Enzyme design. Structure first.
Site, PDB file in Angstrom:
ATOM      1  N   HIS A   9       0.810  -1.212   0.000  1.00  0.00           N
ATOM      2  CA  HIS A   9       0.000   0.000   0.000  1.00  0.00           C
ATOM      3  C   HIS A   9       0.851   1.274   0.000  1.00  0.00           C
ATOM      4  O   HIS A   9       0.289   2.354  -0.137  1.00  0.00           O
ATOM      5  CB  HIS A   9      -1.077   0.018   1.100  1.00  0.00           C
ATOM      6  CG  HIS A   9      -0.593   0.300   2.491  1.00  0.00           C
ATOM      7  ND1 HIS A   9      -0.495  -0.705   3.434  1.00  0.00           N
ATOM      8  CD2 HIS A   9      -0.310   1.483   3.087  1.00  0.00           C
ATOM      9  CE1 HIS A   9      -0.119  -0.114   4.557  1.00  0.00           C
ATOM     10  NE2 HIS A   9       0.008   1.204   4.396  1.00  0.00           N
ATOM     11  N   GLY A  45       1.494   5.752  10.517  1.00  0.00           N
ATOM     12  CA  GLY A  45       2.929   5.695  10.252  1.00  0.00           C
ATOM     13  C   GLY A  45       3.592   4.415  10.756  1.00  0.00           C
ATOM     14  O   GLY A  45       4.773   4.166  10.483  1.00  0.00           O
ATOM     15  N   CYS A  60       2.738   1.338   9.796  1.00  0.00           N
ATOM     16  CA  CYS A  60       2.710   0.332   8.725  1.00  0.00           C
ATOM     17  C   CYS A  60       4.095  -0.167   8.371  1.00  0.00           C
ATOM     18  O   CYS A  60       5.028   0.626   8.271  1.00  0.00           O
ATOM     19  CB  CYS A  60       1.979   0.858   7.497  1.00  0.00           C
ATOM     20  SG  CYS A  60       0.218   1.173   7.765  1.00  0.00           S
TER      21      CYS A  60
HETATM   22  C1  LIG Z   1      -8.002   4.090  10.398  1.00  0.00           C
HETATM   23  N1  LIG Z   1      -7.246   4.382   9.193  1.00  0.00           N
HETATM   24  C2  LIG Z   1      -7.621   5.315   8.324  1.00  0.00           C
HETATM   25  O1  LIG Z   1      -8.547   6.091   8.554  1.00  0.00           O
HETATM   26  C3  LIG Z   1      -6.864   5.378   7.006  1.00  0.00           C
HETATM   27  N2  LIG Z   1      -6.038   4.207   6.695  1.00  0.00           N
HETATM   28  C4  LIG Z   1      -6.257   3.703   5.329  1.00  0.00           C
HETATM   29  C5  LIG Z   1      -5.457   2.455   5.045  1.00  0.00           C
HETATM   30  C6  LIG Z   1      -5.875   1.576   4.045  1.00  0.00           C
HETATM   31  C7  LIG Z   1      -5.207   0.394   3.809  1.00  0.00           C
HETATM   32  C8  LIG Z   1      -4.107   0.082   4.571  1.00  0.00           C
HETATM   33 CL1  LIG Z   1      -3.316  -1.451   4.341  1.00  0.00          CL
HETATM   34  C9  LIG Z   1      -3.642   0.935   5.556  1.00  0.00           C
HETATM   35  C10 LIG Z   1      -4.320   2.128   5.801  1.00  0.00           C
HETATM   36  C11 LIG Z   1      -3.839   3.091   6.893  1.00  0.00           C
HETATM   37  C12 LIG Z   1      -2.331   3.406   6.845  1.00  0.00           C
HETATM   38  C13 LIG Z   1      -1.898   3.451   8.286  1.00  0.00           C
HETATM   39  O2  LIG Z   1      -0.859   3.900   8.742  1.00  0.00           O
HETATM   40  N3  LIG Z   1      -2.920   2.892   9.057  1.00  0.00           N
HETATM   41  C14 LIG Z   1      -2.805   2.655  10.476  1.00  0.00           C
HETATM   42  C15 LIG Z   1      -2.138   1.549  10.990  1.00  0.00           C
HETATM   43  N4  LIG Z   1      -2.024   1.284  12.302  1.00  0.00           N
HETATM   44  C16 LIG Z   1      -2.577   2.141  13.157  1.00  0.00           C
HETATM   45  C17 LIG Z   1      -3.287   3.305  12.770  1.00  0.00           C
HETATM   46  C18 LIG Z   1      -3.908   4.182  13.695  1.00  0.00           C
HETATM   47  C19 LIG Z   1      -4.636   5.249  13.254  1.00  0.00           C
HETATM   48  C20 LIG Z   1      -4.777   5.504  11.895  1.00  0.00           C
HETATM   49  C21 LIG Z   1      -4.177   4.694  10.974  1.00  0.00           C
HETATM   50  C22 LIG Z   1      -3.414   3.566  11.377  1.00  0.00           C
HETATM   51  C23 LIG Z   1      -4.015   2.491   8.290  1.00  0.00           C
HETATM   52  O3  LIG Z   1      -4.916   1.764   8.656  1.00  0.00           O
HETATM   53  C24 LIG Z   1      -4.610   4.438   6.909  1.00  0.00           C
END
Ligand SMILES: CNC(=O)CN1Cc2ccc(Cl)cc2[C@@]2(CC(=O)N(c3cncc4ccccc34)C2=O)C1
Ligand SMILES: CNC(=O)CN1Cc2ccc(Cl)cc2[C@@]2(CC(=O)N(c3cncc4ccccc34)C2=O)C1
Ligand SMILES: [Cl-]
Lengths: 305, 298
Positions: B41, B136, B138
């Site tokens: 991603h 961040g 990921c």
């Molecule tokens: C809740 N997440 C969102 O609103 C958007 N997110 C879309 C998205 C879509 C696909 C994929 Cl495989 C990753 C992702 C994101 C990328 C990323 O860093 N994350 C996160 C990971 N860990 C903890 C987090 C805590 C808060 C917010 C984001 C977090 C995601 O889920 C971001």
């Protein structure tokens, strides 16, 4: 999201762990630059522990009586001195993996990571706090003496604890890296017991602010309290007194959530009175006191849910 | 004495963490030999359509203060593999392994290729992990260490609406019925890992906590009929065999401990705690208990 008891990455400390042997006793040492720091009880037998005269035992030793092993390499001891309850062994090789470091003495309520080691080999890392009674509730077996506690800030490792012993209740006692014990303990097998322990109030409050940040407010109420009335109630549940310093330190968390410290104190008072009623806070059925205000700010998001 | 949620020493993994940036997206990568592994991603969906529009120079890989040069790229399931021109001199002995629900592992949480914390967790029966991750994170990895060999088992991808986490093995295959994209995704109803609760009850007995023991036993079937009612995972004969060593060290038969657990589920703890906890803990495996109560080093 989420809230875990998080330890610092242990890599910088792993590169300092060595094995120290003197006679039949083996324990861990911390190798920084050309010095190995270890508990002075490495020069003792079990018999010596009742009333050891460390100055008398040390003067009978020469440099070559101390065997220091770093991985598979034997380090050569070229000097030795005692500083309080810590033995400092001058070695002929400076540690090439020596990180940027400081020796810091912490206060009760402060947290740190522990790298538990046996035979100079690290086995695990966990997070813990210096209890108000100066003991630590660690996980240590025989041979873990010399294992260290630390914090990391901007690549600088602050060493705050070195493990020396287990008390009859299963709790642990040790020193700062200058060999001064935390608590009224001695590195002697004497009748010494930990004082009655108390809950670290400022830490429970910080953790309640962490729960608010992560989206949970069920425990809040419409009341406030004075600092004195809060302390009169808290002392009845074996909670440490909350000082004005503690209130000042909780300022940032109060501003990020919009909940005044004395309003959060009123919520704590009610939680102590009622219990949790089958509910949990950050996945816990007990009020957690091993996260400081600084740990909450470090781990939690800057944006409240 | 003492019992803590202990993580493996993270040093060997810290020396592999790098920052990967593609366009506006920044996340963590794992640098092993001359390959950087990271979530696909980072290029964000039709992934091999977004990937063909990219060249090697579009991926910026930073290892500490040094910029690594990408000389190739390929996709394996939900993981992107970036061939770099420098082999990692700190590459440990490693394997990529897929774990099962109930198994535990250490997580090195990173942001911008910089490790910030280490914690221990378990793969839940619903394939999610209850971690502590912010935006961040990921590309943060999960691992176990067995004789200086690091077994990488997890790479963090996303957070679900309930605050729990989802990711893949190091071959890019997701744990659980998830996809790497913004869509309506929810974790299934979770269950308690029974064999782990039993292992933790044995750890409590080893540590001098025996108030919950009783004179009774139970059959495996009667225990499972009761456990199914409290959302506990079924206990199999394999689980009983795996608890064998702990049963011999304490003198308490597995079905004898199952009768203690049945009484704890039916009556609660009555204001009492076990290893400083008012809940029945399920994130310590039988092997974790044996290792922490023995002194295994790395
Ligand atoms: C809740 N997440 C969102 O609103 C958007 N997110 C879309 C998205 C879509 C696909 C994929 Cl495989 C990753 C992702 C994101 C990328 C990323 O860093 N994350 C996160 C990971 N860990 C903890 C987090 C805590 C808060 C917010 C984001 C977090 C995601 O889920 C971001
Ligand atoms: C529990 N203590 C004892 O049985 C005797 N111990 C007296 C004693 C007295 C003073 C000093 Cl400064 C050291 C020590 C020993 C040295 C040592 O290795 N320990 C230990 C340290 N950590 C955790 C342990 C867990 C189990 C068994 C021993 C442990 C001690 O306390 C030994
Ligand atoms: Cl402090």
């Amino acid at each position: 999201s989420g809230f875990r008891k998080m330890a610092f990455p242990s890599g910088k400390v792993e590169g300092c762990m060595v094995q120290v042997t003197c006679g039949t006793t083996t324990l861990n040492g911390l190798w920084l630059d050309d010095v190995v720091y270890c508990p002075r009880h490495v020069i003792c037998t079990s018999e010596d522990m009742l009333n050891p005269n460390y100055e008398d035992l040390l003067i009978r030793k020469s440099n070559h009586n101390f065997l220091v092993q770093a991985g598979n390499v034997q380090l050569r001891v070229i000097g030795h001195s005692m500083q309080n309850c810590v033995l400092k062994l001058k070695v002929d090789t400076a540690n090439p993996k020596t990180p940027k470091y400081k020796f810091v003495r912490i206060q009760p309520g402060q947290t740190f990571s522990v790298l538990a080691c046996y035979n100079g080999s690290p086995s695990g890392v966990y997070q813990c706090a210096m209890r108000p009674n100066f003991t630590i509730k660690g996980s240590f077996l025989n041979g873990s003496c010399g294992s260290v506690g630390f914090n990391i800030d901007y690549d600088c490792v602050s060493f705050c604890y070195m493990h020396h012993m287990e008390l009859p209740t299963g709790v642990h006692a040790g020193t700062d890296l200058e060999g001064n014990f935390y608590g009224p303990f001695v590195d002697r097998q004497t009748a010494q017991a930990a004082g009655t322990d108390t809950t670290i109030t400022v830490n429970v409050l910080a953790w309640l602010y962490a729960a608010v940040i992560n989206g949970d407010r069920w425990f809040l109420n419409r009341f406030t309290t004075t600092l004195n009335d809060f302390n009169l109630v808290a002392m009845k549940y074996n909670y440490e007194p909350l000082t004005q310093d503690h209130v000042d330190i909780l300022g940032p968390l109060s501003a990020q959530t919009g909940i005044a410290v004395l309003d959060m104190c009123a919520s704590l008072k009610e939680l102590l009175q009622n219990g949790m009623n089958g509910r949990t806070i950050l996945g816990s059925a007990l009020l957690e006191d091993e996260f400081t205000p600084f740990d909450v700010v470090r781990q939690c998001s800057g944006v409240t849910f």
